[PDB]
């Protein structure tokens with residue numbers, strides 16, 4: 297028992313991290329097969345980042361200007377192309393440590409592990425959620441760009457995120473591995489508004505199920521509710537509206553605990569309206585929304 | 601910016617995880633050089649765990665009874681010995697993925713990453729603290745025994761923990777890599793009292809410094825205190841007494857922020873006495889104690 301914010305083991309991704317230097321800028325790259333993927337802003341200087349013309353900037357760069365270093369060995373760049381906001385550097389060597397992988401674009405509310413890197417070197421791993429407003433609340437300092445987010449299913453690594461920037465609000469923005477930003481963000485040093493963020497309701501309910509499984513049951517009450525009545529309360533507290541699809545995904549947890557989804561919603565409604573009264577749930581004094589129903593099932597059953 | 605409960609990249613430890621089977625019991629082992637380390641309770645059956653005589657139980661076991669499997673290849677066991685609560689299985693092959701490593705016995709209050717494993721396979725990684733009462737609040741299900749805790753300094757993995765058991769209270773107990781339990785715990789299926797746990801005061805102060813560095817400054821006040829006055833309050837709220845050694849370790853954070861340690865203590869005193877008034881610090885509604893002053897410095901400076 298016990299419930300932790302667990303990240304995936306990062307080994308398969310560590311073997312893909314490289315350092316990419318272009319001019320005076322150095323960030324992280326992802327080496328899969330014979331391609332190195334990195335944020336296209338590696339070609340910008342401090343003057344450029346304010347209003348960069350990436351097409352014009354990339355034209356002044358040749359294969360020999362992209363310095364890709366894997367650990368201590370230098371990779372030979374034989375091709376360069378820009379796909380949306382990522383650069384794809386074709387190298388002459390396939391990464392011998394390339395795991396089985398997919399590029400996937402996650403949905404808001406889904407979770408993933410981030411391997412924070414600097415100079416192509418991994419420093420730490422943590423689990424986070426793609427916020428409903430398409431930002432992530434990570435831990436990224438200068439040089440962390442090109443650090444990636446992923447999920448692991450047995451031997452397959454699904455890369456879902458590449459870090460590009462920190463907004464003036466301190467939240468983080470990035471792209472999928474095809475270089476498409478999550479959200480309305482652009483790779484430009486300009487003030488950018490992240491949408492109104494909401495709490496991922498289905499994840500909070502999944503976490504309440506995880507709490508019941510582990511013994512924290514004080515919040516369970518003698519009440520029930522309807523999807524419509526629950527959503528009136530969810531709207532008032534800036535929670536994502538619960539849909540029947542969310543109820544269906546909570547099915548296995550509802551089955552395991554014997555607590556109907558709408559009964560769990562009534563507990564959540566009471567917690568939203570009354571607060572925690574100084575108590576904690578799974579060692580937390582707030583309602584946790586960065587565990588999906590799949591995370592709860594995996595953790596609560598020991599999926600390796 | 602941003603502050604996350606970051607674990608070390610687990611790759612160097614993933615390459616050391618093996619499955620160890622003895623009779624009908626299977627748990628995790630740690631393969632370093634030509635030795636596989638695992639909990640000695642791998643030799644117990646369900647009857648044995650209540651009052652095991654490990655010396656007598658191990659005598660009925662020969663090298664051929666310990667089944668050690670690394671991924672998909674079987675290891676040949678050529679020696680077996682018990683050192684405190686761990687078994688050391690000498691294998692005929694040195695692990696080609698053995699990183700530079702040390703066995704270290706951590707102090708209470710220190711942090712480490714845990715690579716939770718099942719059947720020798722890594723499922724997730726998380727950061728935790730060795731509680732002042734020598735327990736850890738982990739996430740461990742049946743089969744997780746033999747999962748290890750570690751710290752990483754550049755290329756050196758310092759193994760500090762091996763999981764052995766869950767107490768009836770749901771907290772976790774284990775040993776250092778020499779098989780010595782942290783705390784008063786024994787590897788016996790009997791009710792065992794963990795001491796009164798206290799909050800790691802120096803870690804809370806380190807985390808308040810991390811908050812100031814990231815912009816959460818609402819808790820800073822116009823007050824100061826003394827070590828003696830602070831400790832009167834720390835005792836009332838079951839916080840570890842702050843020593844000059846703790847003040848000295850907070851030195852770099854105090855220097856970076858320009859907030860004297862005793863001034864930070866006055867803020868903490870006010871938070872202990874008034875609560876958070878519904879506010880959060882670094883996205884947390886309680887005082888976090890699982891970040892050491894070294895963790896804060898490393899994270900806030902990007903140490904890889």
Ligand SMILES: CS(=O)(=O)NCCN1CCCc2ccc(S(N)(=O)=O)cc21
Pocket residue numbers: 337345438460461462463464482483484485486487
């Ligand atoms: C952190 S730095 O010295 O400004 N380097 C350039 C970062 N830089 C490139 C990537 C795009 C981007 C977007 C926003 C912003 S910010 N935080 O609003 O100034 C900076 C930015």
Ligand SMILES: CS(=O)(=O)NCCN1CCCc2ccc(S(N)(=O)=O)cc21
Pocket residue numbers: 641649742764765766767768786787788789790791
């Ligand atoms: C989890 S199990 O089916 O009881 N397997 C034996 C575990 N088992 C071996 C390791 C030592 C130990 C210590 C305490 C306890 S408990 N939680 O108090 O029963 C069980 C225990």
